[PDB]
Amino acid sequence: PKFKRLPGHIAIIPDGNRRWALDRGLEKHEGYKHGIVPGLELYDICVKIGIGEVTFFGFTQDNTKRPQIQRKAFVDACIKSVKELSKHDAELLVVGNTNSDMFPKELLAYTKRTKFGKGKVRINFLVNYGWYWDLTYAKKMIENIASAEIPRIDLLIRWGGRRRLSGMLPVQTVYSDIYVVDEMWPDFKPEHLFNALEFYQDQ
Amino acid sequence: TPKFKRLPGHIAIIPDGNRRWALDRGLEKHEGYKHGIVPGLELYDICVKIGIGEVTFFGFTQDNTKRPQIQRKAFVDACIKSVKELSKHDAELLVVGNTNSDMFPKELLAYTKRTKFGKGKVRINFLVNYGWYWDLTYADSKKMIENIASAEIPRIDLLIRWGGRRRLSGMLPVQTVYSDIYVVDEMWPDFKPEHLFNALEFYQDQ
Ligand SMILES: CC(C)=CCC/C(C)=C/CC/C(C)=C/CSP(=O)(O)OP(=O)(O)O
Ligand SMILES: CC(C)=CCC/C(C)=C/CC/C(C)=C/CSP(=O)(O)OP(=O)(O)O
Ligand SMILES: C=C(C)CCSP(=O)(O)OP(=O)(O)O
Ligand SMILES: C=C(C)CCSP(=O)(O)OP(=O)(O)O
Ligand SMILES: [Mg+2]
Ligand SMILES: [Mg+2]
What we know:
The structure is a homodimer.
Chain A: E1 9-14, H1 17-23, H2 36-49, E2 53-60, H3 68-85, E3 90-95, E4 114-115, E5 121-129, H4 131-137, H5 140-143, E6 155-159, E7 177-180, H6 190-202
Parallel strand pairs in A: 1-2, 1-6, 2-5, 3-5, 6-7
Antiparallel strand pairs in A: 3-4
Helix pairs in contact in A: 2-3
Bound molecules: ligand FPS (2 copies), 3-methylbut-3-enylsulfanyl(phosphonooxy)phosphinic acid (2 copies) and magnesium ion (2 copies).
One 3-methylbut-3-enylsulfanyl(phosphonooxy)phosphinic acid binds next to strand 1 and strand 2 of chain B.
PDB class: transferase
Keywords: cis-prenyltransferase, transferase
Assembly: dimeric
């Protein structure tokens, strides 16, 4: 589909993976592996329509306090997503608290933005991320927040039906238009993104 | 008033859509703000009746002060009248904003220290000549966040925005990190009790 106006930078909150799994009769931790292909599909659509920058919420510092079986699954799914995007022309950046045992060592290779292939889209991941860590990391202070290499967000899209930011990038979300999909993240469809983009061009 | 299982401790209000409301009625854009005063007082009356302990209103931003003088004078006048009218109720009032600016109305400097009027049944905060960057930069790394300009305003449970835009417009980025966000399509001067009741049903059903 054709759009009159496109956001320069979209933020994604891929919430609802545990509810999705429980609804399918799987264990709570089994939804995250079903969240990988939706991200790659979203990326593909963004390359096709020409979105310049996408930031995914991977996991928060609070999420690390979840049951180990869940953490290992969502961490493994974040690593696989990043690794897979590095094979398909993403310019990748991971932002999160690397001074923590909970930062996945496999993503230390991505903490300075790295072009893969043609670098068709800037893809950012928040991993072991907290708003408070971000702001206090730090007028040099605001330009020096931990997420300073992630620019202002135009459109934030959240799956899972919760209408909240969960502390995603408070500086970059000040003026973001927010679109909520009721379906859980693993039920992602191209129409969810097209509906958010219709909403955005109407603002 | 329904038998809520739970209420928000703190609601934030974004009373957007006043210029659109005015234009729809054939008025000049600046004339909508005076029609946003009584809706504020109605929202206060409902909050006191149902037991909401704390409300924060978005009064106007530093960016809003770049609008035409006739608009600025009207929304400043409407914010002054709102605060004064609320001072006749059982409200503990606090204004937060950049007072080191000729755009801060001198009439509201008195309310920069939280002040209990009558029985002080609800705490009401108002953001006047507010900007998120001014707030955060106002600020040990811990002391910094506890020392933001808006530090006397706690975490927001529920944010309700009129005028159909789904965005924060830089309202209190620290306090809104986890806020549930409810958007009413009607402009602020078309405030109805059911808008607040619908937002509260939404909040408790989360
Ligand atoms: C696309 C991408 C960034 C990576 C692929 C793997 C995924 C989807 C990671 C997200 C991890 C978490 C903790 C998301 C919240 S869903 P939840 O655990 O809060 O579930 P619930 O809301 O309880 O249903
Ligand atoms: C705080 C309170 C309860 C009442 C005091 C009077 C009012 C309603 C003041 C709010 C002032 C502003 C600038 C609101 C934005 S509506 P806008 O100018 O952006 O209108 P538009 O979105 O363009 O329709
Ligand atoms: C990694 C993310 C998708 C962000 C957190 S989604 P999470 O379920 O942790 O957030 P809340 O519903 O606000 O409790
Ligand atoms: C209600 C307020 C005082 C906050 C601003 S609503 P305003 O129209 O200024 O904000 P945007 O829609 O983001 O342009
Ligand atoms: Mg969740
Ligand atoms: Mg407006």
